[PDB]
């Protein structure tokens, strides 16, 4: 069709590789560009492995508020928020918070640690009916993003199903998706990436990613101005390891799907 011409186009244009997966939950329908295809998740790996510990706190009840206690040998590159917390330590609850809204890479490790390693959230992920997730490594070695390395990669197609799943869908109890969805509309790291491709007044809950090669990645739940909600995966990967980012690519990627959308 026309979206698929033009993100046909727009890859061309970006002169790396686009991967694209839009579910409209207004008519169960879903648009895609390389949908099936694995890219680096780099950050955007981060919602699965909070909706695992998510998911454990429904049967375990106050364990997002375990606090857990962060050690300066923790510390990897990139860590605003859990680099404060060396005396205090941080609840599971927030180093979730941490780790979604900031992307604070330590947070995501110490998760990993909690929940007993990166093979715990691929086991997560195909409780969820997700084949395709696969985490190997923790913060900062999971970012590589080598073309033809299958480590830490996902598709588009399986990344938005899942993502439907644990916030509109019956993956999570009703406290925890909405708890997910609640951290993902706070995010501080998404103004340029897909929500600058969205109309100003449209609600959005995303996750960005970012990694070697120039990996450009943002994951969200949209919620359209008297709309069904839509969700939104576009991975972007380059040639060159030393690759500069390029949100404008995911940018013009989410208002070419989303288009019709906004016109009706």
Do not use: C
Not at 197 to 205: R, T
């Amino acid at each position: 069709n026309t979206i698929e011409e033009q993100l046909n186009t727009l890859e061309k244009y970006s002169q790396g590789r686009l991967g694209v997966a839009l579910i409209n939950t207004e008519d169960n329908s879903q648009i895609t560009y390389r949908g099936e295809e694995r890219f680096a998740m780099a950050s955007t790996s981060k919602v699965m492995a909070v909706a695992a510990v998510l998911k454990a706190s429904e049967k375990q009840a106050g364990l997002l508020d375990k606090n857990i206690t962060i050690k300066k040998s923790d510390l990897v590159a990139y860590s605003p928020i859990t680099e404060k917390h060396l005396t205090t330590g941080m609840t599971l609850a927030e180093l979730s918070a941490a780790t979604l809204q900031y992307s604070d890479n330590t947070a995501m490790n110490k998760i990993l640690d909690y929940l007993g390693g990166p093979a715990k959230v691929t086991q997560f992920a195909r409780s969820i009916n997700d084949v395709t997730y696969r985490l190997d490594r923790k913060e900062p070695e999971l970012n590589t993003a080598i073309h033809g390395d299958p480590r830490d990669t996902t598709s588009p197609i399986a990344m938005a199903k899942s993502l439907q799943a644990l916030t509109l869908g019956d993956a999570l109890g009703q406290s925890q998706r909405q708890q997910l969805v609640t951290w993902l509309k706070g995010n501080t790291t998404g103004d340029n990436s897909i929500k600058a491709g969205l109309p100003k007044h449209w609600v959005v809950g995303d996750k960005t990613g970012s990694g070697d090669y120039g990996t450009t990645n943002d994951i969200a739940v949209i919620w359209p101005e008297n709309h069904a909600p839509l969700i939104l995966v576009v991975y972007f990967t380059q040639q060159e390891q030393n690759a500069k980012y390029r949100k404008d690519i995911i940018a013009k990627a989410a208002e070419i799907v989303t288009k019709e959308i906004s016109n009706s």
